[PDB]
Amino acid sequence: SVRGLAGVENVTELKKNFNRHLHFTLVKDRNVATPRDYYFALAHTVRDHLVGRWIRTQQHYYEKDPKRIYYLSLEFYMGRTLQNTMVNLALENACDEATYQLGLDMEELEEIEEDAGLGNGGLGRLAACFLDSMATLGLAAYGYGIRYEFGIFNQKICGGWQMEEADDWLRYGNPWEKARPEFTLPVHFYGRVEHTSQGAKWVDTQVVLAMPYDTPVPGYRNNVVNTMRLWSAKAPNDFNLKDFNVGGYIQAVLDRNLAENISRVLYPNDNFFEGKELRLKQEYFVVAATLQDIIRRFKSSKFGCRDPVRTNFDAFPDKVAIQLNDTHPSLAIPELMRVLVDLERLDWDKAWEVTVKTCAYTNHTVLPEALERWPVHLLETLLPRHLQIIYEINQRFLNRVAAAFPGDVDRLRRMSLVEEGAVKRINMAHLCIAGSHAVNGVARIHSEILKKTIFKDFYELEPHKFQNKTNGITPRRWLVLCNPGLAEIIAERIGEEYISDLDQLRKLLSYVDDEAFIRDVAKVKQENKLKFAAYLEREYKVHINPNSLFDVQVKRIHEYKRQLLNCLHVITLYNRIKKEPNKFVVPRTVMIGGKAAPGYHMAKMIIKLITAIGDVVNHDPVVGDRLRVIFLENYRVSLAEKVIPAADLSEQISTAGTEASGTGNMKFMLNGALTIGTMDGANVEMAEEAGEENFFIFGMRVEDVDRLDQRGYNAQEYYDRIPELRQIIEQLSSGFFSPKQPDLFKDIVNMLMHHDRFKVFADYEEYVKCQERVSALYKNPREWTRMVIRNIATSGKFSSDRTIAQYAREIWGVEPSRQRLPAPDEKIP
Amino acid sequence: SVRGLAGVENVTELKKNFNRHLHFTLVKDRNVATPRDYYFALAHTVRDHLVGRWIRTQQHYYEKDPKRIYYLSLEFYMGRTLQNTMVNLALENACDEATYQLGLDMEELEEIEEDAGLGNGGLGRLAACFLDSMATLGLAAYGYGIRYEFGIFNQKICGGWQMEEADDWLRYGNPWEKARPEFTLPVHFYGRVEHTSQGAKWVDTQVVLAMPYDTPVPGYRNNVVNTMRLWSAKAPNDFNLKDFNVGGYIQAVLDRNLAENISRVLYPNDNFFEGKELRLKQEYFVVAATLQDIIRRFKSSKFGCRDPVRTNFDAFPDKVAIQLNDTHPSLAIPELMRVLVDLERLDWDKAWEVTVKTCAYTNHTVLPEALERWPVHLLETLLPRHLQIIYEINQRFLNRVAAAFPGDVDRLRRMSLVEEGAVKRINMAHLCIAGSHAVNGVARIHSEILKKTIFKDFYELEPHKFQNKTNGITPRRWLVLCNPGLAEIIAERIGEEYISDLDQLRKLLSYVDDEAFIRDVAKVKQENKLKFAAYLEREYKVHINPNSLFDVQVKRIHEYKRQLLNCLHVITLYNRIKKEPNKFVVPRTVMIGGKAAPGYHMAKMIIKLITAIGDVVNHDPVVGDRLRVIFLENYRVSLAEKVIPAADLSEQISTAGTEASGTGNMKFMLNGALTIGTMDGANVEMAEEAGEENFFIFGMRVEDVDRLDQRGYNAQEYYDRIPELRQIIEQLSSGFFSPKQPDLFKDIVNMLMHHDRFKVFADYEEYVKCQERVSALYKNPREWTRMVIRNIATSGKFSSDRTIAQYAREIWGVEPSRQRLPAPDEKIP
Ligand SMILES: *Cc1c(COP(=O)(O)O)cnc(C)c1O
Ligand SMILES: *Cc1c(COP(=O)(O)O)cnc(C)c1O
Ligand SMILES: OC[C@@H]1[C@@H](O)[C@H](O)[C@@H](O)c2cn[nH][n+]21
Ligand SMILES: OC[C@@H]1[C@@H](O)[C@H](O)[C@@H](O)c2cn[nH][n+]21
Incomplete structure (x- = not known):
């Protein structure tokens, strides 16, 4: 197999670094180091090679300033990562020879690693493949999701039956991610809306911190290393604890570890809708935080440096692209409106035009029970302003519909983001369509049914939005x-x-x-x-x-x-x-x-x-x-x-x-x-x-x-x-x-x-x-x-290179590439 | 100041390693690295120097096989550690010059570090000083305690009043400790005792895992680096979650993070007794785990290799010494009896003799409200066997008392480890005395009152146990x-x-x-x-x-x-x-x-x-x-x-x-x-x-x-x-x-x-x-x-060198030293 070159020099440098991490990083010694420590010594040694180009790739984006693709998914089925890393960098034959010369078998070492199972199945693995392709295709892409303490439960069959054992995948830690506590962002929940003539104020909110964890995503032999940023939940040490009024400190210390439950576990509903407040919290959690990072990077580019001086979001859609993977991060639609209208004070019309030009929704299944429809009371309580913004989106959308199909009253009922009944609900899928400039199916036949049945109405109003992106x-x-x-x-x-x-x-x-x-x-x-x-x-x-x-x-x-x-x-x-x-x-x-x-x-x-x-x-x-x-x-x-x-x-x-x-x-x-x-x-x-x-x-x-x-x-x-x-x-x-x-x-x-x-x-x-x-x-x-x-x-x-290449050219507005970006070698920035 | 030598070569190697950690370890670059990253680059660079002798010191103990001193304390007021580390190794002038040549001010960097406040005050800081001295005195000592997520609350005065803000000291992590998940031990709680003619079985217990975290403790310029092992609590991923019967998996995932609450926070009772089941759990938590490690290292020494073949615990007291810092880890008395009698099957008499020859209790205050007296029902429930063993200790102790002072009935009442009343309680202090071969006060006057008042009875029975160890x-x-x-x-x-x-x-x-x-x-x-x-x-x-x-x-x-x-x-x-x-x-x-x-x-x-x-x-x-x-x-x-x-x-x-x-x-x-x-x-x-x-x-x-x-x-x-x-x-x-x-x-x-x-x-x-x-x-x-x-x-x-030197010679049975152990330099084990 031509899994790379087993260079004499590279092999010697590898073995050196392998022993260094074993000593200093693991604080072990060959006369006590188990296959696991050996696995970690290698993992770290390989990790080093990632960091160089990782730093260089991200820095590359600051200078060149290419449009950014943010892939929002509440799942990223990563699996192991050492072999993939080793392959995408051309390090497999060097590492094999290296460990061999050490007397270690790389195959047994790889078997020590555990699955980074932040996903149920197809949805997550697609995201994982996509990530790899966007990097291989030289796309300035960032994968955003949640850092689940425990991914999907480990399956045990006892007596012919399934047993749900927890996935304690972080037990021995993960040598791939890099905690970035310095970049922890604040997410707000509950509260109320102070409404004035001069604006709207979401106030009296419970805060939850979002600690980012960055994992490097290496493209195949092109020296491109993108980033997957996963949010970890952490309680704010202030509002909690300090409130001696009944909080009792100790209890409040324990209650601190309750808001952190947001990124605790992946909901085992392999594509199924359970209207749990925790899930909604998980979704909003990653949307707000992610959107803050997005606006931040937009403000520190050519705009918040020069350009029109006062941050003009007109070019926001030309610099930012957020891909809604299913309706999970659909809150990105009203959230982007909240930020742009409430905080940035842009007029509604301006914001919406901008929002729709930025977002694109990807439909994954036509099966009804997998569709997200949150009870109005839920949104009204957990996120009051967003609900008010959704109602405004809807009224204007339906106002357009009615004008396109005058008198078609049932159509209005069918196209309402708001569903009536015993419990009024909000159709997330409708939100995404009204709020995205593109909607796509995951296969030729799938995308057709979308235009023929389920979104036939939306298709008749905006035939131009619908596309197909057959999975890869x-x-x-x-x-x-x-x-x-x-x-x-x-x-x-x-x-x-x-x-x-x-x-x-x-x-x-x-x-x-x-x-x-x-x-x-x-x-x-x-x-x-x-x-x-x-x-x-x-x-x-x-x-x-x-x-x-x-x-x-x-x-x-x-x-x-x-x-x-x-x-x-x-x-x-x-x-x-x-x-x-x-x-x-x-x-x-x-x-x-x-x-x-x-x-x-x-x-x-x-x-x-x-x-x-x-x-x-x-x-x-x-x-x-x-x-x-x-x-x-x-x-x-x-x-x-x-x-x-x-x-x-x-x-x-x-x-x-x-x-x-x-x-x-x-x-x-x-x-x-x-x-x-x-x-x-x-x-x-x-x-x-x-x-x-x-x-x-x-x-x-x-x-x-x-x-x-x-x-x-x-x-x-x-x-x-x-x-x-x-x-x-x-x-x-x-x-x-x-x-x-x-x-x-x-x-x-x-x-x-x-x-x-x-x-x-x-x-x-x-x-x-x-x-x-x-x-x-x-x-x-x-x-x-x-x-x-x-x-x-x-x-x-x-x-997925073909799929991604289509998303890039047809939805994102970016031309993929395949040119090998340079490696740092020795220079340190 | 002669804070060491600022060697030309050492200075250059330091700056090199400083930039290496900044790049690879922090994944930062000088054009984005804040004083904090700079602080971490140095901390890690210095950490490297610890590991070499750290590995060598521990290995030294395996070969030589000196008696081991285990200092059990539920508090270790460590404070910062970079300057101390830098000083104890002779690295202060080299590091100052090094960062200076980099253009960084070491003083500002040191101010970035936060207090490792796993302690309230005097008790913990004493333990911290002791640790440093035992290392400076070349003692094979190990500090054992709990790894609190949050140490003691940070104090804020708002309007002239105290406000309890949480101590999120692990936020940016701690570059000193080394998680050792591979050495996680199982602690048992609740349950019942299956009693047979062939033995006693503590069964039907709830399990809690004890994950160790090792921090290096460097002695002053003698190249000795001991270890402080702190236990972190973690739920076992099996009994929890898998039980689909009502557990509902998700809820059980959240409930998993409930047993982990044991090492959550330090109880703010700066020496005061609150009969909380959590505290008792915290105490037992560190006693059992620690005692497992102790027995383990005893079994893998000259005994479980050769010697009498069948592990004969006679020489246990000559190899092991556990110091009970206050009555907090007093459970070590019945726990050592449990292990030796139940698991190791030694006869009661043999075990007790061994137990008393191993343990030594240190009394810190005569003030009554700080004395631990747990309600019998509490122990009966949370730790049934231990309570049964305490009752047996007591009966034999009192049997000795009665025989020493025939007819002195009130004496028996006064010397009973069991206190009667509306709520029967167990006097932990009495346990420690009956179960230790030495009891000491922390000052000349303090130790005298102990023999004159509070332990006058115990002193009359065993005048030989009481000593003084004026603090350092x-x-x-x-x-x-x-x-x-x-x-x-x-x-x-x-x-x-x-x-x-x-x-x-x-x-x-x-x-x-x-x-x-x-x-x-x-x-x-x-x-x-x-x-x-x-x-x-x-x-x-x-x-x-x-x-x-x-x-x-x-x-x-x-x-x-x-x-x-x-x-x-x-x-x-x-x-x-x-x-x-x-x-x-x-x-x-x-x-x-x-x-x-x-x-x-x-x-x-x-x-x-x-x-x-x-x-x-x-x-x-x-x-x-x-x-x-x-x-x-x-x-x-x-x-x-x-x-x-x-x-x-x-x-x-x-x-x-x-x-x-x-x-x-x-x-x-x-x-x-x-x-x-x-x-x-x-x-x-x-x-x-x-x-x-x-x-x-x-x-x-x-x-x-x-x-x-x-x-x-x-x-x-x-x-x-x-x-x-x-x-x-x-x-x-x-x-x-x-x-x-x-x-x-x-x-x-x-x-x-x-x-x-x-x-x-x-x-x-x-x-x-x-x-x-x-x-x-x-x-x-x-x-x-x-x-x-x-x-x-x-x-x-x-x-504390004087204090420790006294503990060593007078209680521990070890001769302190001051000879510089060697440094590894380049060789890797
Ligand atoms: C890629 C993948 C999926 C896809 O399975 P489908 O139902 O066949 O499309 C699901 N689970 C795992 C673990 C995968 O590898
Ligand atoms: C050493 C120390 C103590 C001791 O104070 P006392 O009451 O005087 O003996 C308590 N707190 C801190 C932080 C310490 O430095
Ligand atoms: O699009 C990726 C996969 C797709 O291939 C499956 O057929 C579909 O059921 C689904 C739902 N969510 N994600 N997926
Ligand atoms: O022994 C260390 C200190 C001691 O100096 C204090 O005076 C005493 O009140 C106490 C209690 N616990 N620990 N301490």
Whole structure:
């Protein structure tokens, strides 16, 4: 592997610095230093290399003064960072040789690091990939979010059930972030509005400090190092404590550690709306603080130095761009108006024009329960002024609507940011649209439905706002990092340029017929299957028969992702084996992983099923090798980089129209797995890219689901007209998979049979047939690898560099780049 | 000043490392680095020098295997640490030159650091001095306590009143400690005892993790660097959170941050007993954890390697020594029995013999309200086994007593560790005596009363246990650090050896008659008076007339310290000035500082008085320079190092028999101030050391207070027979010092007049006469300085090196040393 150069001098300098940090920084010594200390010695040694260009990149922005892109997200699924750092700087071969010469194994050291899991799944990982791409593309970008004490809970399966253990990821600290207490900002909550003729005053507010923590974000070999600033909550030592009146000091000391709860933990609602005051507080927390830093940097640039002297915010939109990732940081709309109108005293009209030219909203899912609609009373109480500003935004917006569509009264009702009813609520999505100059979907099909259904009204008023930005995945982490084997064989043929531009992967189409290459693609895949089997064994259990089809569905447990459909299929393979015990079937290992939301009972049950089924199957003598059913515990970014490169079959079975885009699919595609999925989200574009013949699409298309809704879904029909399906439902309701507790899956079955919003039965037959075809192709090794080479070669479009390049040129108003910024070397500023 | 050598090479290496930490460690650059970053760059640069010998000293102990001294204290008043570190290593002149060449002023940088205030006052500072001495004396000592998030509250005086603001001392972090999460230990609480024939099991306990934080403790120029390990509380991520049963995960995440409250804040009860379950938890917290580390290091020495193979604890007392600083860590007695009996399965008799040979208790005050007596129900609940073990200790102890004094039934009642009544309690002091082989007082007079009154019974049973260890103060911090001016002039005459052995100060008696030296002692004192006036001005207010007697009483506000007596005296000087407005009196500035316990109403009032009086006095035209009354805000270790060296008069007015020892007195003595005090605590030994003629002793002696108690104290008598005293009481009750609120001091007066447990009036006359004599001597500059040279020269006995040397030889069983251990230089272990 060409993971960089193992320079003689660099290697010697590295080992020196490694021993220095071990001594001074860790205060350890080789005769007492554990793999962990060794891991930290390296981490710090590598960190040093980041700081140089980190300082230089940020300074670069002050001088040149390019437009700034602020990516506001309440999630940043970072995963480990040492290998990525090592790769993006060209330090992997130097560090390997260096630690080797020390007698340490870099692989074991990397396994010491823990996931910086400040995210649930797709939303956060997208942000993480985006961050990496914006840096690789030389964009003056800043990732802003919350610094959760504990990211997403660690998953433990005890007795087939999920257990929520806390993610104490900061236990041994994090050698990547840099606390910046000197830059702690004040956030205000509650209060009231003193209204005068000369202005509005948000007053009598409870203060919460926002302590920033900066993490360096290195671009691939271009010497660009951006910043991700995460806010940590801290109580102000003054209002609290000093108030001897009842506070009693000691109690107040303890109560101090109560406002700090804002950045305590990530809400485990993997895209789901819970109107919790804490969440709202978390959102406002990061919006206000972030927006202060934004205005600050705008004021200290060419304006607050010269230009029109009196800070004229006209050029604010040309210098600032804030991207609202979902509706979570939507408060940025009224907050920017608050600051500009109340503090900066700009007229309303001026502010709004400026606000809309700065903000852009990204819609991630059309599913209604994930939409944020806060009860008016909540906002009225926690943020009075913002609510007053939202009401004013709304009145002017609707005033425009009414003028565009005169008399269309229901339209007004439909386009009101304010929803009436038993509890008046505020539609955050509507806010973002009225307050952004661009709104985008995360996939071709997704963005169309947005203009056709949900935002059809908004689209009719402002067709110019709506766009599409089909999601990306980063080739550094998602290929070079997780699959150094595949990256090597590809590199031996086309060189390493692909890493910075995946579209070059198409050149591999010239090797579809090439014995060597075909054997290589097959060899790496098996190597990877071996490494994962080794990992599953050493870390958990079972010698998963590597000589089998690694069928894998890893993603958050949701009724629309359809793990249940896979469960049905699994039971099917088992039952067929029992009917014809001597009929050869392709040996298979079905791996499903993901975490269920804590209060999501059904999801909990589903997890329980995937394991319950395994108990039977995995122990039937008759099967004894042929079929394995396994649940992958605590599915996270690091496990993703593990399982995926060892994947044969990429399960992407969402009900058509549900999965807005998906990202796991693209990873599987990049890594040499064949996809079995519906015509949903990005699956559609993936199959178009590789040709529907190199894919395994099946089931109802969006139009079919709708026609079925039109007349109503009646699962009983499928149960009556499908005898093999009928058999499984009976094995469930009887207790075949729950002997000790026969009534166990009664609610799963009841839902399936009577309340399936995702039409599982309506896709069972076409699904089992599709799996038959896959097994069939697998029976032809050479043919499977040939279709694989056809998948990898057309993954180019699914790089976040392409996505980001689109956001930059189409929404942000910035031209990405790929020129290597210089390194400091020795000079200190 | 000879604050070390400013080596050309060392200076260059320092500046290099300073810029390195600024860049890499702080990620700053000279064009954006504030004095704070500059302060941190230096702090880290200096920290590096500590680590080398730190590692080497600890390693030294493993090989040599000397007896270990564990100093358990729930307080360690550390103050700043950069200058001390710089001095103890011989780095002050190199660092000054280094930063100077950088253009930075070391003095401003040092002022950036904040007090590591993990202590209230005397108890903690003693521990801090002791730590420094044990290191200077080459003792294998380890300071163990709690790592409070917030030390003692910062004091703010708003409108003449105290305001409790929190001490967020860890805000910008602490570059001295080293978190050691890898060594986190488990502490158990609550539960029950499973009792079998084969043993006792403390079970069903709530767990709390103890994360250690190590701070290096450098000995003066001997290259010895010991360790102070402070425990931080952290919830275990398992029992908490995973329990989905009602825990709800999120709530449990928040509740996780509830057990961590154990090391949250230092209880502001500057030596006072509040039976709070949190405090008890704080005490047990540090006892268990510490004791685990102790047993661990004992097991990995010559025993758990070879020796009798099966860990034989017979030699435990020869290897381990734990010093109970006050009754706070008394739980170490039953806890050591628990571990040895329950876990190690030693017979009771064997364990007890071992326990008593290991532990030694230090009594700090005879005042009853400061004595720990926990309600039996509390211990029964929070620590069931320990309570059962205490009952067994008691029964055997009393069995010995009864056998020594047959029939003495009341004795048994008096010597019972168990106190009967409406609420049965456990006398912690009795525990410590029955469980320690040595008990000591903190001053000659204090230790005698212990054998004569309070522990007269225990003394009669075991006369051999009782000793005296008159407190010390450290000459490095308390002279060399705070008074580099005095240390210089002394050094110019007798060399720098005194720093390591203060007894050499007696040589200054040869200069009592020496014009040069007399002028120098006078010159430094004025320089210091100038520097403090400059500090008071730049940091707070008033150009305190440096041409005045700096009369200062700085210490915790308590009725027995008698700030009120000083208040009476102050009002007296003012009133006399009004009677005879043209009669010359020595110009004076009376400074009083200290913090009142939050719920201590009277103390709060007293503070209010000291300021109330100033309002009048400080603004009377007639006075206009002659008399200033000032309250020094937020009196802490750093202010102590400030005010003291600028002190003329050292107010030490405690009611005879109340101040067990005192330490502030010694500091004032070392720094060139004359003392006006009672024959209390160490005042007695100080006057004996310098000859009662070089002191200003006054008031009732212990015998007089008692004879007054015998017949009863009637303040009315003094009010009736002292017309000037009578006048002040009327100015109070009328509202002369509280015009707007005439009834303001009614409770102060009521106490004074009817419930003064400290006989203030009974010492007023003799007190004003003594102050007349002091003013008189002050009128003779040469004579004052001559008596001063007589005070400084006899301070030798009050060094903690002497105290510690006594603890070592008389209680610990270790011979202190003063040989310079080697430095690592370049080699890395
Ligand atoms: C990228 C990623 C996701 C995406 O999964 P989808 O449902 O397939 O799109 C979620 N979780 C993890 C840990 C990821 O790696
Ligand atoms: C040493 C010290 C003490 C001691 O004061 P006393 O009452 O005089 O013995 C208390 N507080 C501080 C900050 C100290 O420096
Ligand atoms: O856009 C990133 C991912 C997307 O790929 C998923 O399909 C969608 O359900 C979602 C919601 N939030 N973030 N996401
Ligand atoms: O022993 C140190 C000091 C001592 O000098 C004080 O006089 C005494 O009141 C006390 C209580 N706790 N610690 N102390």
